[PDB]
Amino acid sequence: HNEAQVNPERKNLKWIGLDLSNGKPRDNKQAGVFEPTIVKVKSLKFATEAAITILRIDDLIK
Amino acid sequence: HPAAKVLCELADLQDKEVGDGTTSVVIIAAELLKNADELVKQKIHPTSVISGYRLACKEAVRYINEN
Amino acid sequence: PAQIRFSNISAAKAVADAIRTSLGPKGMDKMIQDGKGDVTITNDGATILKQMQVLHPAARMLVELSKAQDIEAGDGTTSVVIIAGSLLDSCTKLLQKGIHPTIISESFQKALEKGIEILTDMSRPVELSDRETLLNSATTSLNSKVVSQYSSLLSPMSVNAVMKVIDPATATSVDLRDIKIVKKLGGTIDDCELVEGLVLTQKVSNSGITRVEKAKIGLIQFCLSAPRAYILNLVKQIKKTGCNVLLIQKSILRDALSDLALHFLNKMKIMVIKDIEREDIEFICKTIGTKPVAHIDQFTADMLGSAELAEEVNLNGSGKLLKITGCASPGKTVTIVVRGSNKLVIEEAERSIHDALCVIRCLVKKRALIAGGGAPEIELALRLTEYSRTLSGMESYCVRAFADAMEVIPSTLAENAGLNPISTVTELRNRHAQGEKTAGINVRKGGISNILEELVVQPLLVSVSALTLATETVRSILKIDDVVNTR
């Protein structure tokens, strides 16, 4: 994914997934492992919210 | 633990929202908490950390929506 | 003597420190598991103090400070406690320096009067009614929350209730008595409406007529009881007087209206109303003008109330309310019809309305205003220090210590903003000395600057009352010499 940014021509190298069978990097859009965008986006939102809420609850002494 | 209570509550409501992702959201939240604790150990106030996390999420959803 | 003064100082400072970091819009929230399984999660100082265990007298006095500041103005509840803690810590040095507490108390009183007069004379007051600036202050208070999108639905209605009756109470100040409040579960937030006079929200179920223009109103708290001697007499009295709307009080027995009594009260189809909260009973009595009499014999022709319209109309579709207008002296507590299917749009709406009514009354008690964000505190810490330099005598050091202890509020405000507290508070002090009054902190934009970009703005009375109460309580604590048990 570094080459997806430094190299402006290797744009279609971004979906290199994790091939759990052979344990090697693998183009994953061709492979077909897929996730709904809403799932990832909203999970990121909730992870951030949970981290923020726990991190706010700090100013205690015990 | 009350913090565990909050984390499990967020995981459960996320499950009720979309379904898959509870384990991923819990793992990511724990990793963020560990890293933020390491940061605040270095004399960075948690409010700056929280603002940075919010900015990072706001930028990450935009990056995903374009790629 | 001093052995108990030190204990009081330590206890008060400890109970103030436990809420020190909760100040500001970026206030950090707390979680104290002191109880029997209490999940404490909030950043409001008042609730933390009132839920905190109170064992030392000094802690009780500080909680009383919080309560008095809340009732007086409703804002800066944590501010007064933090100021009191800072003052106590500052005067600890004076006490160990050999100054008798009477000198400290007198110097604090002089500092109080000087600070009050400097804070008000060169502040920014409002001259005309200027409902625009009241709306602006409300928006600075009513936005950035769940009720932010409902500001244009809640603040203008409160402002209209204010302009409807400019109550000449406490120097023509709009008090807590504009137009009596009601609220009913269900509906939507858009269903809010302003009423004029007494309004009933209790359940009524009459299949006949309950709508008469000359709505005579009676209050017979004496209901049916299990022994005919004192059962049917009230029906005859009502029939002779001709009352159509008579709320029922169950202060005698639960069986307020039995089947036979209801059928006897069904011949005129009198309005039946139950479950009236006691705090609103006297408000309703003074609204109608009738007396809260629980005796049927005392009930006479002079007991008849005044009304113009009384309908059990299903307002907003499914909201059954009884609006009454043209009474003797209505206007018990500002009306906001809290309608909403959601739970949060009820409790948060009511809390925001209470904050708005407090701040509106706060600005009408005195028409001066100051810019928040630590500007008044640094201004005091500068001007009172200048005074103490000009002030003679040995109390000058006590006045200087008072001024210095007044610096905590901007420091903690900036610390909760993540800035380096010392550097930013002293930079603000320099900018304030060489500049203008309105220099404050920009907490939620990452920086320090003037108020014109910020315009947080708060009424003068919140700061005035907080300062006055904090000084009075530190005076009282300092004058304490011993506490004795075994009454």
Ligand SMILES: Nc1ncnc2c1ncn2[C@@H]1O[C@H](COP(=O)(O)OP(=O)(O)O)[C@@H](O)[C@H]1O
């Ligand atoms: N064929 C696959 N190859 C690699 N990873 C996969 C595959 N199928 C699913 N995953 C992984 O499963 C994860 C989501 O499953 P998970 O969150 O454990 O489900 P649940 O939320 O029900 O526990 C994703 O992070 C995804 O990477």
Ligand SMILES: Nc1ncnc2c1ncn2[C@@H]1O[C@H](COP(=O)(O)OP(=O)(O)O)[C@@H](O)[C@H]1O
């Ligand atoms: N948006 C803001 N920008 C700068 N300062 C603020 C802002 N909001 C509040 N403040 C300051 O922070 C203080 C918060 O008062 P606080 O004691 O927290 O009230 P309460 O105890 O009712 O929550 C106020 O005195 C105000 O001057």
